[PDB]
Symmetry: D3
Subunit: 340 residues, 6 copies
């Protein structure tokens, strides 16, 4: 957990994040060309960052956003496939792990159902060791089929990694779920468009703190014909302090070293802000002093979560009374999104 | 949702938060004296803030922190009781609602079990309309018996209010639970000691954003013999932007107007960052375009929450493997907190 | 007055501002090509911002700065003309209002007098509803003929709009004049070059506060052969708080919703910082309590403004004694600007 | 214009500003006691700041705010009087100039009309050389009789000084008026209560920039029974950059050196942001190049100011249509302030 | 190197720094009373910070600043003496190390030569293990006899500590000297008065970075009759990032954990910003590639340092030509400081 | 020392710094093409900045970084040579001084020893008046032969200038050496890659403060195939306050005026923070009051500097025990950098 150098040691994972300029592409050949540019960039960066162990690219960095449905279908990737092979070679050549974005990944029922929005973690042997499908797509504008599982993967030097995508990060639950599965680094890849710049910068930090986890964010930059992406890729410590943060500049890079031993020393020995421990041992001091044993309380005291787990339709109905009952709103209509 | 004036209108609730100087008290008579000082302060403030509809005092602002167990028991309050009556009179006199702290509130089995750490919302008729007992006490150092329920109360001008205390706020779940019950303002009262200053400033903002809720934070200030409290009381909009924020100064005050109609207009019509709606309608655009109906997906896709709800002991066991198995740590022992 | 979403509601005007990359152009055909790029950008943005009701482009965004006098004359536009028609079509197609820059607009005596520097507000039917000529050109370097009038126009959803340009904004008087005519949003379009970056960021906010008005700023970016433009396009509330702000990035975009009902509720009911009201009712409490009626004092107590209005030549003479008597200075000469 | 040292030179005026803790006083004897504390503080500070040439205390620093009308009348000062004599002795003893606050100063018709809120500049010989009565009292809450004139006084080392008070500063006109009379430093003394902290910090800087003037702000701190004052006393350069700024701390001090020769060199030779010059020579480059002489345009092109000067009642009527027609509002009533 | 918790582990030293309110004292009995208050504060803090291993108090925190020469002499301490015994007991009782300030410490020729300004490091057995005399007193105002040596002491958990005082920190040389002797933490104790607040905040961070060292700063707060002290006590990592920072508040506290293993892992394995290594192996890559061996260059290439070491009088003469030749200046005279 | 305008006066040097986009070049013809682009940019900028007296370009701005050794040798420049002639013409044409980068400059033994990394100061007559070779190259990655001397040159309007390059700036010694030779402005030209962005922004400011010198920093921007450069070119006052600062944007420009008379007035008359004076007159007040004459102490009390000057090999050995003994580390190996 330290910032400023280009090295990495047996104790630290050198993480690089990339403010990748958002492509505006249309064909499979253009996607492949751009995959190769990413691969070239990984290899170049390694030559400047000898400590680099993990390189992180934004959501949509390979295809851009395929606004046109037909082009979306025609360019949706297989995984493994030609794109991931192009990425795998660069990971082997540069002896790094990497996180890359396939938007879309073909649905099992392609081309008759929406593609997934997907991330892969590829190791320094070029092997895909985690494939994560975005659980909370950025509706209404974006049309990806929602995934349903988070994953934790042993990463470089043993650092436990989970991947999440863009809009997922707005939802504290996902960051909780990954940390509770053991994640030591949550990697958030995004093509996060203006407007919500300060809010997204703040959310990553707050999640790092709340879940006692390293966080790495790679966000796209530039204007792509529709949206302007605000960069601010960053790596953040498990104590909520930024290591390094990019600005809005195209193809900015940040790089930081995250200590394996520091996060484990902290999860073991921290007390007042050992949030993962504390949430499931509530009021331990009190129960000890009241003669009720020394574990505190584990029971979930939040009816929202009880209800969502036992009766998701009721949780939904509940929320619709607070918000609205249709996915669309007649005051701001959007074609193909129903309202009224 | 606007900042700078001392007025309030039919549409806005004028919220004042107080950087109350932490008392260092020892006897019931001193507590009562200090309750009266708070009451005097409410009445004075009203004369300078004619728009004031809600006044918020920090956790521990009435008793301070009763470090000595015997004094803790001797000073624990009934609710209703003499303290709340003193507060109620000031709310009637100043025609404001108020949030006040009783630390401790007598346990049902007092003096044989730890007191609760409690907040009350008192209306402008002097009536207690919400009593909230802290669900996640600041263990290990503090010994309060944990509460188990959140509440939503119709407040001034119809604004829906939930109360939470200090350490609760580190845990996104609580802020979710209150908003999912309908809360429009989550009031976080704290006696939040250094060190974790920037982290707590950031957490309130991030929670306001993540839960599309107004947030008001009153935090104590000064040194009390043990801890130094860092102030930064604040009121924050539902879009994650601070309205006004205090510094670390003793008896700082901030004041902002929060629009009833703006938060409801937003919860109804916002789309990309209507987080409460979106969490229970995941991938709606995708499912529409894939021929699967127009509601998106409501189902909880996070195994942590499923497991915590169905088998809290397993969730606990899981977390102990990531952290530690005893509430204490031999590397930093604390008397009465077991370890090894 | 809220920030973060892409929607807009019956109550809010969705304003987008653009950090448009400064062109370096030379011919009428190149200007027309670039007008079409702007139009294309409006249509694209709308597809990502369904709430968008108003889109704002920087001063010089259409022609760039025509440094060469002959090219300046050859490219000066008529209004209405081919450029505005190109803009009008994009406003109709995207069902938005827009603010566009013509630099120059032909003088009535073209080509024998300097062109104006001009902005137009075009409605969602493609009709020009306000044409504003810059009153305080950025002398000495820039050569535009000064305009002489501010305007207030009923805009989208009834929001009252005034336009101002760049250097105008340094002068509090202009922002006062527009607000005193009824303006609810003052739109400041600029091609504001380094050096004065922080000063210009601060000025917009301070003016929003001082005049209880929404403010939207679109500023150019990039290097154009002569000047580097620093972006920081922004939308600011009437309480002086930024909604959203760009960085220095080329073709950044920000987007915010400004509430019609909030600004009117505020101008009606605010008291301590109802600056527009207060300036013309000075010392009301005092005069009431002194038995002098209940209106306060309206009379202008500032001799500078009395003198400027009655005897502008004397105001000028006065200022020349404090500054200098010639437009140029021999310590930093500039060709065609006299000094000594 | 430089910050960091305790010295001052023949070229620089050493200005100290004081975050004076707001008194809560009630009697003439208590006011005199507190005047003596201020005097003692001036003498002490000088021993630590040998460069100090000007010391600035907040509005209300001598009496506090006399909330009770009878006490307000009983404590209103003569000028010259016993308070100013107490101040004058400290200025002579410490060989400094000073700015002190008398709230109230007796009306000419005392006790039958409201006192003024007044500042004095006292030279290093103990002579009162400027007495300024607040032109825009902080209505509705505060009841001072409004003054009607600004002043410019030759100060230490020849530095031209104008004084303004608190709420005046929200109004750009006043800062313009003083600079247009020749002011090189505008001293703003305030007892500026929360809420509007960031807005007031920003306003001073923006005014320094807009009027090419040094600015010094002394603001009170602490809680006085009614209001909490937020400090942030500061000295700001004529280029809009803060020299030094206090926090919210009681009896903070800042100190900076302001160069006589730098501000005069700037007012003489600055060009693009010589705002005082530019406002009365608009479009000079354009008129030169259009064959219309080399002075630009001086004429006031702002109808608000024309109307306010010629027909203040009409300006008032105009503003009442945009805001409200009565000084009070029924949605937030205040006793003795009429509404409906 | 992590921030937020109250614990500490076998790997981390828990450092607390105190924004101690500056005393205004006059007699030996008052000094002893205040020493006891400090001791009481150490013991109290420990009860809230169980991880605390090192507690740091500001320069002047024991005596305040003895402005009066006679009182300065009458209150100058022996070390060891009654004050240090009072401190030692609190370190033993709270099982912490501590850094305390004696201003003055008796000169060897007391009372005929100025006292030193001195710091002591006292271990958790109450033993004085380092006594540092300020090398660069804050002339002209302060009169302490200059010390001449820096020290490095094995501290808690083996962490290597050097002490420096206030004005020393403005001079990069001192921080270099301590790090080059092996220091892992440089503790800077100060009673650092306004004006130079931002400059001092920045200097500590920059020194932490430049010397790859932990830094802890304890600075006084409050007004003492002469000076106002600006707090901002802090602990900073060896990568130049703040762990935690106080504001200007009286008796603020910050607390952070500094990893023994992280700083040693970094000094061993960092490459591009291993400044201590790099300064004495300049151009290693170049010399390797030019066939000149693999150590780079160690030789001092800075004539200032060569000259200062070999001929300090010449270095002095040199500097006097750039600045002035007498310690005082006639433009800002100070009694007992000669000029002209 | 003032910021915001485009003018300059007899008293001020107008300094422009350029966030030059990092080239990716390979041949001598491409280098010459890019030299011409720089020249064109100087001439253009002058037309927008009539006050400009000094223009500053980043390290590597002419050649980019020649990663390939053969291309490095083939493109290394003579000085004077064709590149400098191209620069000299633009300085004459635009009547400015300039600082330009030649990376590499041919070694005396070219092509058999590594080129230098070099800067030149070229006057407004096109004459090279200072040539500085980087003393501390950015090892390990970069291979330049280390230089050994700093220089001070009379610059525009008599302003004394020293040049330093990139990595040099991390080392306080260099900034000391230049100021102690008389430098009034230290110009730091860098191609400073991410990661260490905030650290480098802070270092320049801290050095400006510590050495009572103006500082100008020009840093490259963009991605060059290997590294992403973070801009933040800036000009900083001798009191440690930024005048103006760029962001990360390609071809950003900042411009500020630095007063000749202000820095000399300050070095003459400042007292508490006259660091250059104070370092060689330590404890003057104390020695005066102790009867030991009125010069304070000049002697170097820092053993590191004594040892480095007398026995550089011992200083080296000392540092290797604190860091490591080989230039490389086996935990992060780099080809051609030995370790173990
Ligand atoms: Cl999505
Ligand atoms: Cl608790
Ligand atoms: Cl212009
Ligand atoms: Cl007032
Ligand atoms: Cl000292
Ligand atoms: Cl280098």
């Amino acid at each position: 957990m330290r910032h400023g150098d280009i090295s990495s040691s047996h104790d630290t994972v050198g993480i690089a994040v990339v403010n990748y300029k958002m492509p505006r592409l249309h064909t499979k050949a253009e996607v492949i060309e751009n995959a190769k540019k990413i691969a070239d960039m990984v290899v170049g960066m390694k030559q400047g960052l000898p400590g680099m162990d993990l390189v992180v690219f934004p959501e949509y960095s390979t295809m851009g956003i395929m606004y046109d449905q037909d082009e979306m279908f025609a360019t949706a990737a297989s995984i493994p496939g030609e794109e991931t092979a192009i990425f795998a070679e660069a990971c082997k050549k540069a002896d790094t792990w990497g996180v890359f974005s396939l938007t879309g990944e073909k649905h099992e029922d392609h081309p008759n159902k929406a593609p997934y929005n997907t991330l892969v973690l590829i190791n320094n042997k070029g092997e895909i060791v985690q494939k994560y499908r975005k659980i909370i797509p950025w509706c209404p504008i974006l049309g990806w089929y929602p995934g349903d599982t988070t994953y934790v993967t042993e990463g470089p030097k043993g650092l436990k990694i989970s991947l999440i995508v863009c809009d997922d990060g707005n939802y504290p639950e996902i960051w909780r779920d990954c940390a509770m599965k053991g994640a030591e680094l949550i990697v958030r890849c995004q093509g996060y468009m203006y407007p919500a710049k300060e809010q997204q910068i703040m959310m990553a930090k707050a999640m790092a703190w709340a879940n006692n986890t390293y966080v790495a964010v790679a966000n796209a930059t530039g204007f792509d014909g529709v949206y302007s992406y605000f960069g601010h890729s960053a790596i953040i410590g498990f104590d909520g302090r930024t290591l390094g943060e990019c600005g809005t500049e195209e193809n900015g890079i940040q790089y930081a070293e995250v200590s394996i031993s520091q996060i484990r020393d902290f999860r073991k020995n921290a007390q007042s802000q050992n949030h993962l421990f504390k949430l499931l041992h509530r009021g331990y001091t009190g129960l000890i002093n009241s003669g009720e044993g020394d574990r505190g309380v584990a029971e979930c005291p939040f009816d929202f979560y009880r209800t969502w787990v036992l009766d998701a339709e009721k949780a939904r109905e509940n929320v619709e009374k607070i918000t609205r009952s249709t996915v669309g709103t007649a005051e701001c209509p959007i074609q193909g999104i129903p309202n009224e």
